[PDB]
């Protein structure tokens, strides 16, 4: 599957872009 | 852990005539800037293309450069980037982020007529595509480099039914790099591993 | 809005048809462009450290002869070039050419130890004011007055086998920032293409 | 003529094939990495993955995907080192390194993943510079070549490879060592001829 | 033309150059 | 050789030796 660290990094960026 | 710091410049802009880089790269610090066809070397909010030299330049490029005039205003507000055509001639924008947004072919070139404006980039949409691309693998994330660049031609269109089929056939064009998105991409791409097939040292 | 240019000129170096190295920006009235190797003197543009993996034997030989090079200096509204090299330099300055009644493309030799006034701001400003009455194109073409090109060692034009500056092995292109900003103040007021 | 200490210990220019790509990077800290990623704003990282070149070919596109963690370059105690952090090798042409070990000046040395190499020693350059003074203007003038180091990612070049010159490699960098260059200027300006 | 502001801008530049 | 060039190179040799013996160099 995908690398969980990359998923988490992308998740934090999506949060930052929402803020 | 790698250190990250906020970009001092939200974008960089490189100018080209046909397939040739012309002039130094411009770096924008304030939220609004104009790229125009005039000649002030010393305004940090104006990238003035009229002073840039090209001893090799042909007649079509010279003629086209006289029409840039007031050019394009580029501005970054609330996570979005806009381009407003101040020139009396249209500008033509290839923004992969717009093309994704509207379901257009990735190479689509969108005209901005004089007096009009286009949202050429939305940070949230980029961040959403970045997260979706992780699940598709290294190559899908690596290809997002292209999403962080927008190319614009003054005066002349290219693509589709235009005679010019590639940006390097247009006489006067700029390449914008969006630094915020590039740094976000770096944070993800550095966690995506390597390509699946290795690369020989000899081939 | 305008602010005084922090740098009176910028200089780009070329070998034949290829840009070589970064653009140099001058902030003190006198600078030298030489063939030596200090990367860190704000008053010397040292061409000898610049690399070009594509350079040919003619360029390598020319670079050996740049030496002390050219001193370029800006005093009292005028710009001067002095040949410090033991080989000549060759200057194409349309502002200088117009003052002497020469063809705009004239390339003037400056032999070792000699100097030439390559620009006069008052002559440019007078031409700019006259050009406004002649229309947009006349003002726009004045961008060419704000660029001066110079070759080390090898001439070009007229009698020479080399007919363009891009045929010379080592040359520089100077932009005069004060005249460019003056030109902007007028060009931006001349009226839009429609 | 007066001198001031270089603000940057090196500058680095990237190339694809025979063409410069992107702006020159100037190193302001003792260690930096040149890598295949995309941060524009770290003074210790020259990220080549963000640099554009429309119409680059498939071989350059492929090589760029394998730069990865790239090379760590660092300067300490008068010496410069290169460490291959990439999962692909890097190939270094440093005349200072080649002379120290007795190899031909144009030798290209492979640094495999995880390995390092001392690519420059300032004292050996200073000794060679002082010796060259006794040999004449030309001997000193040629030492500019010692102050530049070329390195390719992924693809070898030179006598051992089909690729003959550095300009046939898809991705390479050229380092200028500014301290040595200023030292050379202090001598060369006094040599005459 | 020329537009009045262009004539005025050039006039001020000519005065600045003459003083210099 | 030109004496100004010998003297420049002599001082450079000294500086190069100092770089190899910084007070903080433990190895």
Swiss-Prot record, chain D:
UniProt-reported outcome of changing residue 53 to K: Found in a patient with Marfan syndrome-like phenotype; uncertain significance
UniProt modification remark: In response to TGF-beta, ubiquitinated by NEDD4L; which promotes its degradation. Monoubiquitinated, leading to prevent DNA-binding. Deubiquitination by USP15 alleviates inhibition and promotes activation of TGF-beta target genes. Ubiquitinated by RNF111, leading to its degradation: only SMAD2 proteins that are 'in use' are targeted by RNF111, RNF111 playing a key role in activating SMAD2 and regulating its turnover.
Membrane-traversing stretches: none
Positions of post-translational Phosphoserine modification: 193
Effect on the protein upon substituting residue 133 to R: Increased binding to PPM1A
Phenotype upon changing residue 185 to E: In a colorectal carcinoma sample
Source species, domain of life: Eukaryota
Outcome following mutation: residue 35 to V: In a colorectal cancer sample; somatic mutation
Residues covered by the MH2 domain: 9-193
Effect of residue 103 to A: Loss of interaction with PMEPA1
Localization per record: Cytoplasm; Nucleus
Tissue expression: Expressed at high levels in skeletal muscle, endothelial cells, heart and placenta.
Binding partners and assembly: Monomer; in the absence of TGF-beta. Heterodimer; in the presence of TGF-beta. Forms a heterodimer with co-SMAD, SMAD4, in the nucleus to form the transactivation complex SMAD2/SMAD4. Found in a complex with SMAD3 and TRIM33 upon addition of TGF-beta. Identified in a complex that contains at least ZNF451, SMAD2, SMAD3 and SMAD4. Interacts (via the MH2 domain) with ZFYVE9; may form trimers with the SMAD4 co-SMAD. Interacts with TAZ/WWRT1. Interacts with FOXH1. Interacts with SNW1. Interacts with CREB-binding protein (CBP) and EP300. Interacts with SNON. Interacts with ALK4/ACVR1B.
Family: Belongs to the dwarfin/SMAD family.
Disease tied to this protein: Congenital heart defects, multiple types, 8, with or without heterotaxy: An autosomal dominant disorder characterized by congenital developmental abnormalities involving structures of the heart. Common CHTD8 features include double-outlet right ventricle, unbalanced complete atrioventricular canal, and valvular anomalies. Vascular anomalies include dextroposition of the great arteries, anomalous pulmonary venous return, and superior vena cava to left atrium defect.
UniProt function note: Receptor-regulated SMAD (R-SMAD) that is an intracellular signal transducer and transcriptional modulator activated by TGF-beta (transforming growth factor) and activin type 1 receptor kinases. Binds the TRE element in the promoter region of many genes that are regulated by TGF-beta and, on formation of the SMAD2/SMAD4 complex, activates transcription. Promotes TGFB1-mediated transcription of odontoblastic differentiation genes in dental papilla cells. Positively regulates PDPK1 kinase activity by stimulating its dissociation from the 14-3-3 protein YWHAQ which acts as a negative regulator.
Name by which UniProt lists this protein: Mothers against decapentaplegic homolog 2
Organism expressing this protein natively: Homo sapiens
Full protein: residues contained: 266 to 458 of 467
